[PDB]
Amino acid sequence: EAGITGTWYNQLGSTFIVTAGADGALTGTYESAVGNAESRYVLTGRYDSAPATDGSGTALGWTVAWKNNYRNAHSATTWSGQYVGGAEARINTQWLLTXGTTEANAWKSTLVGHDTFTKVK
Amino acid sequence: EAGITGTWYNQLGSTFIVTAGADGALTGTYESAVGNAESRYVLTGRYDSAPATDGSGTALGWTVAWKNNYRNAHSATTWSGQYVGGAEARINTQWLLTXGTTEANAWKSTLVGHDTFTKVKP
Ligand SMILES: O=C(O)CCCC[C@@H]1SC[C@@H]2NC(=O)N[C@@H]21
Numbered sequence: 497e498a499g500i501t502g503t504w505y506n507q508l509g510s511t512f513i514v515t516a517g518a519d520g521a522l523t524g525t526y527e528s529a530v531g532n533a534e535s536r537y538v539l540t541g542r543y544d545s546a547p548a549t550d551g552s553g554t555a556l557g558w559t560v561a562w563k564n565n566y567r568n569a570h571s572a573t574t575w576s577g578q579y580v581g582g583a584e585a586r587i588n589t590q591w592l593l594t595x596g597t598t599e600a601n602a603w604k605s606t607l608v609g610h611d612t613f614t615k616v617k
Numbered sequence: 618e619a620g621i622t623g624t625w626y627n628q629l630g631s632t633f634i635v636t637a638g639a640d641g642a643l644t645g646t647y648e649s650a651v652g653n654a655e656s657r658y659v660l661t662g663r664y665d666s667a668p669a670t671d672g673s674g675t676a677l678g679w680t681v682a683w684k685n686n687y688r689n690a691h692s693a694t695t696w697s698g699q700y701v702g703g704a705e706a707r708i709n710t711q712w713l714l715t716x717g718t719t720e721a722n723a724w725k726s727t728l729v730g731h732d733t734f735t736k737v738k739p
């Protein structure tokens with residue numbers, strides 16, 4: 497899926513590089529502009545490979561665990577969202593970032609936010 | 618890693634079958650007991666393959682897009698959470714289910730909830 501496949505940036509200046517496979521897979525790398533992160537992290541996810549043709553977005557999501565060969569934040573973010581095609585293509589998401597915690601600190605394990613991604617072209 | 622790998626069930630009786638690669642990959646299938654869903658769906662995700670040394674949980678997350686050979690709900694769920702090992706291992710998660718919508722209806726595109734998984738068969 498050519499629509500989704502490519503390089504994307506969000507409002508924070510973070511970079512998402514993705515390939516959308518015919519079987520519904522998302523694969524690529526994510527670089528965050530912020531937080532306890534440096535360089536590129538592996539991402540994996542899924543997308544609706546037979547969307548409605550109806551002026552609806554394409555549902556998708558992906559996960560980054562924030563461990564690479566440079567740093568380990570002991571945390572993972574999932575972005576859940578939809579892809580909106582056309583000339584000014586966007587991925588509108590909400591996200592959940594969970595950090596590994598003790599049982600006593602589990603109530604404060606999870607941040608929530610929203611990122612909007614613009615495709616670079 | 619052996620602890621996350623296995624067959625889990627949540628409070629709804631959904632079945633989450635997963636394998637944790639040495640490297641950080643999660644790969645498996647998900648069968649939901651509820652919603653616009655039947656049979657198994659492909660899932661992939663990631664987890665911290667070197668968790669902290671202080672008895673913290675293991676951060677992890679995965680996605681399912683709700684299309685398989687039977688059905689397509691035009692929606693995707695991501696679970697974000699942590700694995701907590703020991704005697705009664707648990708994966709405690711919060712999730713976001715986004716349905717494809719018009720931009721008009723984008724405000725009402727995303728459900729949020731919370732699932733807890735154990736390896737006890739319903
Ligand atoms: O600090 C961490 O634990 C890891 C980096 C987190 C960066 C987050 S993920 C959601 C939000 N979107 C971004 O592009 N960066 C932040």
Ligand SMILES: O=C(O)CCCC[C@@H]1SC[C@@H]2NC(=O)N[C@@H]21
Binds near residue numbers: 627653690692714730
């Ligand atoms: O109805 C849909 O669009 C697809 C199925 C959604 C099932 C959800 S995912 C979150 C929650 N946890 C489950 O095990 N089932 C529901």
